[PDB]
């Protein structure tokens, strides 16, 4: 059996914004720490579901952002990293709508995504 899931692309900051605009809209910035840790856990369970992957890959433009190289230090300091996995939901304008600090289980994660982009009250 062979099934994969979410696969983030890797391109530079200018390329990211440009690609978001041209491909569709919105940039899903996967910020990870060199530690890895939970990153592979999500890669295990979440990166097997076609629906969760499709929703992310289609409704956003995916990007894996470095935190050790590639000007990562600025985003690290400016967006306030606290742990290892950090998800940044950013518009093509270069403004974030929500900073997800931490990682929870797949259903909860998907939930946090929606609540971050479209906050109900």
Which tokens is 85 given? Answer: 């996995």
Q: Is-catalytic flag, 31?
A: no
Q: One of 22, 36, 45, 73 is an active-site residue; which one? A: 36
Q: One of 8, 21, 23, 39 is an active-site residue; which one? A: 39
Distance separating alpha carbons of residues 43 and 3, to the nearest angstrom: 12
Q: Is-catalytic flag, 39?
A: yes
Within 10 Å of residue 118's Cβ, how many Cβ atoms? 9
Asked if 46 and 52 count as a contact pair (C-beta separation under 8 A), the reply is yes
Best CA proximity match to 24, nearest among 53, 56, 58, 51: 58
Catalytic residues: 36, 39
């Amino acid at each position: 059996a062979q099934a994969d899931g979410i696969a983030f692309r890797e391109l530079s900051f200018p390329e990211a914004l440009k690609r978001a605009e041209v491909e569709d809209k919105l940039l899903f910035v996967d910020c990870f720490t060199t530690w890895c840790g939970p990153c592979k856990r999500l890669s295990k369970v979440v990166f097997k579901d076609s629906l969760v992957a499709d929703y992310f890959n289609r409704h956003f433009v995916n990007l894996k952002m470095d935190m050790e190289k590639g000007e990562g230090v600025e985003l690290r300091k400016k967006y306030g990293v606290h742990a290892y996995p950090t998800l940044l939901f950013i518009n093509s304008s270069g403004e974030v709508v929500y900073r997800l600090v931490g990682a929870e289980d797949a259903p909860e994660l998907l939930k946090k995504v929606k609540l971050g982009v479209e906050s109900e009250g």
